[PDB]
Amino acid sequence: VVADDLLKLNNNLKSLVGAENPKRLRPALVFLVSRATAELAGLLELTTEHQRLAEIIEMIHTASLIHDDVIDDSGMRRGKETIHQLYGTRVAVLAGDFMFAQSSWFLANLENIEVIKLISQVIKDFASGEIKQASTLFDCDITLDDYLLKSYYKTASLIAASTRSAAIFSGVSTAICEQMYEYGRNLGLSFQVVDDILDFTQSAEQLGKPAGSDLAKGNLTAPVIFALQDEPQLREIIDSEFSETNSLATAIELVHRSGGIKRAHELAREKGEIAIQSLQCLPRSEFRSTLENMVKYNLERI
Amino acid sequence: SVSSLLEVVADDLLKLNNNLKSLVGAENPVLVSAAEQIFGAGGKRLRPALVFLVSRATAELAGLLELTTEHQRLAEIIEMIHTASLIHDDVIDDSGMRRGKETIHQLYGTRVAVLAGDFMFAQSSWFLANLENIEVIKLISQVIKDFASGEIKQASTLFDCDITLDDYLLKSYYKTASLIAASTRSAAIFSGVSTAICEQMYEYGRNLGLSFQVVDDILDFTQSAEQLGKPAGSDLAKGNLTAPVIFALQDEPQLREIIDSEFSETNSLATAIELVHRSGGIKRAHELAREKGEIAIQSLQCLPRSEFRSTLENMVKYNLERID
Numbered sequence: 001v002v003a004d005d006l007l008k009l010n011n012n013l014k015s016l017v018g019a020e021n022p023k024r025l026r027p028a029l030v031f032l033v034s035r036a037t038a039e040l041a042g043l044l045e046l047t048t049e050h051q052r053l054a055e056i057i058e059m060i061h062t063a064s065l066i067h068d069d070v071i072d073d074s075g076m077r078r079g080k081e082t083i084h085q086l087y088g089t090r091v092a093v094l095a096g097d098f099m100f101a102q103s104s105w106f107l108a109n110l111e112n113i114e115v116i117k118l119i120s121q122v123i124k125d126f127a128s129g130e131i132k133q134a135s136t137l138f139d140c141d142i143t144l145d146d147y148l149l150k151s152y153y154k155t156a157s158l159i160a161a162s163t164r165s166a167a168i169f170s171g172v173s174t175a176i177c178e179q180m181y182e183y184g185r186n187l188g189l190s191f192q193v194v195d196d197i198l199d200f201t202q203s204a205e206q207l208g209k210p211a212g213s214d215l216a217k218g219n220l221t222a223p224v225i226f227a228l229q230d231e232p233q234l235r236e237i238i239d240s241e242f243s244e245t246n247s248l249a250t251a252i253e254l255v256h257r258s259g260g261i262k263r264a265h266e267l268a269r270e271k272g273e274i275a276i277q278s279l280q281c282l283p284r285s286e287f288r289s290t291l292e293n294m295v296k297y298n299l300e301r302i
Numbered sequence: 303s304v305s306s307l308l309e310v311v312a313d314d315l316l317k318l319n320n321n322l323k324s325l326v327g328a329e330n331p332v333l334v335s336a337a338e339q340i341f342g343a344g345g346k347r348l349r350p351a352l353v354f355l356v357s358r359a360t361a362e363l364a365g366l367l368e369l370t371t372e373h374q375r376l377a378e379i380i381e382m383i384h385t386a387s388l389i390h391d392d393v394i395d396d397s398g399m400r401r402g403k404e405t406i407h408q409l410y411g412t413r414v415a416v417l418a419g420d421f422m423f424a425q426s427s428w429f430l431a432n433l434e435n436i437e438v439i440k441l442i443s444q445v446i447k448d449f450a451s452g453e454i455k456q457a458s459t460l461f462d463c464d465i466t467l468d469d470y471l472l473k474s475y476y477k478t479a480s481l482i483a484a485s486t487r488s489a490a491i492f493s494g495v496s497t498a499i500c501e502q503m504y505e506y507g508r509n510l511g512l513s514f515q516v517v518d519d520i521l522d523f524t525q526s527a528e529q530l531g532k533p534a535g536s537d538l539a540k541g542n543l544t545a546p547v548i549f550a551l552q553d554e555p556q557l558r559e560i561i562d563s564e565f566s567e568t569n570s571l572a573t574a575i576e577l578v579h580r581s582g583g584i585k586r587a588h589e590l591a592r593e594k595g596e597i598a599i600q601s602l603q604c605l606p607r608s609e610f611r612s613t614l615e616n617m618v619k620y621n622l623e624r625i626d
């Protein structure tokens with residue numbers, strides 16, 4: 001429901017301002033970059049465009065997740081009517097469409113064409129990437145650059161668009177807008193790499209079959225990609241889609257003993273450092289400090 | 303003949319049809335394949351034709367000597383929005399077929415079909431932003447929201463025999479006429495004619511779009527099952543009650559029982575279709591289509607005489623005479 005979502009954002013926005021006075025992540029980044037750049041621009045309060053932008057970004061994020069979660073009914077010769085009722089497919093599609101459409105309508109009425117271009121491209125690349133996703137599972141030839149680009153299209157691009165668009169609506173210089181873009185992109189990549197690290201390490205310490213982990217479904221991320229550089233048996237096991245009994249557990253221990261987790265953690269740190277450096281075009285402020293702290297807090301999840 | 307009606311913009315349509323394939327890109331083979339499946343399936347391209355005709359009529363009125371690239375891109379954008387809508391409508395309907403070919407979701411599953419339509423809506427928006435006209439950007443964004451609003455309303459009222467005619471006309475506007483009305487107003491905007499002419503071009507497209515939808519709904523009954531691809535009454539069968547049924551319900555109350563049962567008793571669908579024909583439903587729906595067509599032709603009188611205007615008038619006539 002767009003109504004409920006717009007409600008929570010405003011509520012979550014309220015406590016944010018009230019805190020800096022003396023999911024939430026994407027609107028919070030919009031708010032913080034909005035306030036930092038609005039002060040730089042001489043604005044006395046956030047504009048309507050800033051406040052709408054935070055709602056727009058979260059509507060797009062939520063619509064994206066709702067659609068990405070729709071079921072694949074492709075091979076079925078009957079029972080499709082039942083499986084869609086069971087899984088609420090029509091509601092999912094309709095809700096996502098209306099959320100997307102509401103966000104596009106908001107965006108048009110903010111009247112900034114640069115922002116519309118930016119955000120429209122984010123959704124293109126997201127939908128395009130998610131269609132391709134199934135074809136990339138278990139492909140051990142994926143490069144680290146391919147994985148970062150994939151993570152950008154899936155996660156970091158919307159975040160980078162949101163922080164750039166916050167600066168655009170403040171009217172700060174193009175150079176600062178580009179720096180806010182770079183902060184969002186590199187925080188988003190650092191965020192995604194840490195999520196991928198955590199999926200792995202949690203999988204290696206859990207009691208049952210890690211059957212729902214990234215590695216188990218063939219979604220090969222930073223720690224595994226690094227490991228594959230030094231682990232010929234890891235490649236062979238992944239290529240087998242863990243056919244042999246208990247081979248998933250073996251693959252997990254090969255990744256764990258490789259240097260891969262440490263190298264992924266350092267990849268997350270370098271992107272985080274680039275993010276923090278992107279903020280130095282801003283003067284000292286509680287908003288800049290908080291944006292710096294989000295990077296640190298992300299890396300502290302280890 | 304569609305070719306006879308559309309020859310004054312035949313060159314504009316040929317260029318558009320050449321371009322549609324590349325407008326999705328080439329990096330994503332599955333995406334390319336899905337777009338090809340609908341673009342190459344045989345659509346009439348009424349919407350781009352209306353855009354070219356109004357573009358040329360208004361451009362002439364405004365003193366322009368040639369169609370702008372914005373006019374040309376607009377026609378592609380409108381067909382793309384229409385195509386994204388069809389992809390999602392087929393998912394929402396679980397339609398297995400669309401003009402002879404299997405639907406995108408039949409080939410790749412509902413999730414890929416949804417994401418393909420999403421790509422096409424976002425691509426449409428991105429092309430339109432690059433035309434740099436915020437008035438049109440806002441107008442089209444409203445139309446796309448109208449589509450989503452209409453799909454929700456239609457899914458919420460399936461088999462609902464208490465639907466009013468006014469509700470049916472709003473749903474028809476959301477589903478079909480709103481995009482056409484915005485496309486003809488935007489064609490006028492890119493020619494730089496007056497606000498008043500722009501408003502008239504909106505009203506032309508609105509009423510022709512309503513007239514076209516009412517006729518499509520009539521033809522779902524009166525057309526044969528082969529010449530339709532799908533059997534007659536396919537709208538009624540999924541619970542989408544259109545003008546002929548809304549009218550028929552006023553004279554044949556057993557339709558309510560049949561529809562309320564979602565056609566559970568066997569052969570009840572052909573019983574329902576019989577009742578529609580027995581009523582004055584089809585003729586009352588045709589005269590509704592005619593009323594909107596007359597309003598459409600009236601909205602053209604603010605333009606000078608031109609072959610473009612004459613063809614825009616002829617579109618109204620062809621629709622009412624249509625068997626399709």
Ligand SMILES: Nc1c([N+](=O)[O-])ccc(Oc2ccccc2)c1Cl
Pocket residue numbers: 060096097098100101103104107119120123419420421423424427446447449450
């Ligand atoms: N699915 C969809 C719909 N919709 O009405 O279904 C409307 C718009 C849309 O893309 C955009 C494009 C730009 C901003 C926000 C969303 C999508 Cl991807």
